[PDB]
Each structure stands twice: as structure tokens, then as C-alpha cells.
Amino acid sequence: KGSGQIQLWQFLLELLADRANAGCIAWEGGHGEFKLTDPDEVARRWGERKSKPNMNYDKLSRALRYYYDKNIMSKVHGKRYAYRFDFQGLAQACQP
Amino acid sequence: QIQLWQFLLELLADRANAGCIAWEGGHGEFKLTDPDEVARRWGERKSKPNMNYDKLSRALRYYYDKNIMSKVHGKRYAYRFDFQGLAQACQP
């Protein structure tokens, strides 16, 4: 995988594992589907974690496209801010 | 094939499973609302019919040393997910 500090997938899972964050990000729809209830707030919070003050939703959504090819995530068609976590694809990326 | 941590995350990513397992308490903490049901469901997935809560809890405590899961204090049937420790175990 590689390699360094906190990555977007980890931060999103941390946010999704706390119901206190339901106002900006939440598990919704089933089968690893989650929705960005407040896309700009998720982006602002990721900006604080990585000490990147110029962080916005455009840059955040750009970083999610890396996970489609790596098969860690996918984007729900028809919907605007609904994404899906692929735990089988994540576990595969974890294996040596 | 599938490991316990992956199966638990899959269960926890669906609110329809709230009756047996759910994110509760914050900071990666989750509770086994029905411990025997989680164990029964894990038994179906791994085709292990002899699976019970005793065997499941033993496997959950194994992730403490691997730093994927952490012990929760002051709460019964509660476990904590360490996403930092998981990400570290994912790195080569």
C-alpha cells in the first residue's frame, strides 16, 4: 500500500465510525454505501487533519478517484455525493 | 479468505445490522447488541457451524496485539476499531 501519514480512506472510516459526524458524513443505503451530508465540511475537516487550509470538495473528490482504480472505493451513479466502500478491495490492498 | 475485521466492518457499514452490531460511543467504538447473533453470522460466512461468542471474543482480542482493535474500558460487549493501526498493517 504505502506509505507515510494518514490517508483519506482511513480518515473517512474514522469519521464514519462516529455517529456524532452524521451531519457531514454517514453510512446510508447499505453494502458499504455512505453519503457526504455536508461535502464542504468533510473537506474542511480533512484540511485540518492534513494541515492543508486550501482544501475544498473539488480537491477531496479528486483524491477519491485514486481509490476507484485501487478498488478501495466507488461512486454511486445517479446520486451526487454518495460513494461506496469496497471492504473486499481494501482487504486485498492490505495483503502482501 | 475473509477475515473477522473485514466482516465486522461490512456489518457495521449497514444500519440494518444495528440489532446485533453497531457503531456506538465514538472514536471507532462499536457494541455487540446481540453477541451470539454476530458469532452465528460469522459462523455462516466462514462455514464454521461450531462458532460461538467465546471463539469470536478470542479472535477479537487477537487484534489487540496486531493493533487493529483495542480494549474498551467501562463497557460490556464493546470493542474499538484502530483505523491508524489497521492502515499501518496495510503498509508493506
Residue numbers in the entry:
A (entry chain A): 42 to 137
B (entry chain B): 46 to 137
What's the publication's text?
The Ets transcription factor family consists of 28 genes in humans containing the evolutionarily conserved 85 amino acid Ets DNA-binding domain, originally identified as a viral oncogene (E26 transformation-specific). Here, we present the crystal structures of the Ets domains of the entire PEA3 subfamily (Etv1, Etv4, and Etv5) together with the structure of the Erg family member (Fev). Furthermore, a new Ets dimerization interface linked by a redox-sensitive disulfide bond is identified, and this dimerization is shown to result in a significant inhibition of DNA binding, potentially linking Ets transcription factors with cellular redox regulatory mechanisms.
Fev lacks additional domains and has a restricted tissue expression. Crystals were obtained from constructs that contained the Ets domain, Etv1 (encompassing amino acids 326–429), Etv4 (encompassing amino acids 338–470), and Fev (encompassing amino acids 42–141). Etv1, Etv4, and Fev display the typical fold of the Ets domain, which contains three α-helices (α1–3) flanking a four-stranded β-sheet, with an additional C-terminal helix (α4). The structures are highly similar (typical root mean square deviation of 1.0 Å over ∼90 residues), with the main difference being a two-amino acid deletion in Fev, linked to a shift of 30° in the orientation of the C-terminal α4 helix in the Fev structure compared with the other structures. Similarly, an analysis of the crystal contacts in both the Fev and Fev-DNA crystals reveals an interface that includes the same components (α1 and α4 and the β1-β2 loop) as that of the other three Etv proteins. Similar to Etv1, the interface is dominated by contacts from hydrophobic residues, a single hydrogen bond (Asp-59–His-72), and an intermolecular disulfide bond between Cys-135 and its symmetry mate. We have been unable to test whether Fev also forms disulfide-linked homodimers, as our Fev constructs did not produce soluble protein in the Rosetta-gamiTM 2 E. coli cells.
